[PDB]
């Protein structure tokens, strides 16, 4: 039941969407929001 944005340390890689932070980029390096 996670929100639209990617939670901290959450696998962001998969929805082409960054973290909830307006300056957090995706971290496919380790599949997670950077």
Curated annotation (Swiss-Prot):
GO MF terms held by the record: calcium channel inhibitor activity; toxin activity
Principal localisation: secreted
Intrachain disulfide bonds: 5-20, 12-26, 19-33
Domain of life, per lineage: Eukaryota
Transmembrane feature ranges: none
InterPro entries named in the record: Assassin_bug_toxin-like
Subcellular location, record wording: Secreted
GO CC annotation terms, alphabetical: extracellular region
Pfam families xref list: Toxin_30
Alphabetized UniProt keyword annotations: Calcium channel impairing toxin, Disulfide bond, Ion channel impairing toxin, Knottin, Neurotoxin, Secreted, Toxin, Voltage-gated calcium channel impairing toxin
Biological role: Binds reversibly and blocks N-type voltage-gated calcium channels (Cav).
Family the entry assigns: Belongs to the venom Ptu1-like knottin family.
The record's note on its domains: The presence of a 'disulfide through disulfide knot' structurally defines this protein as a knottin.
Protein name (Swiss-Prot/TrEMBL): Toxin Ptu1
Species whose genome carries this gene: Peirates turpis
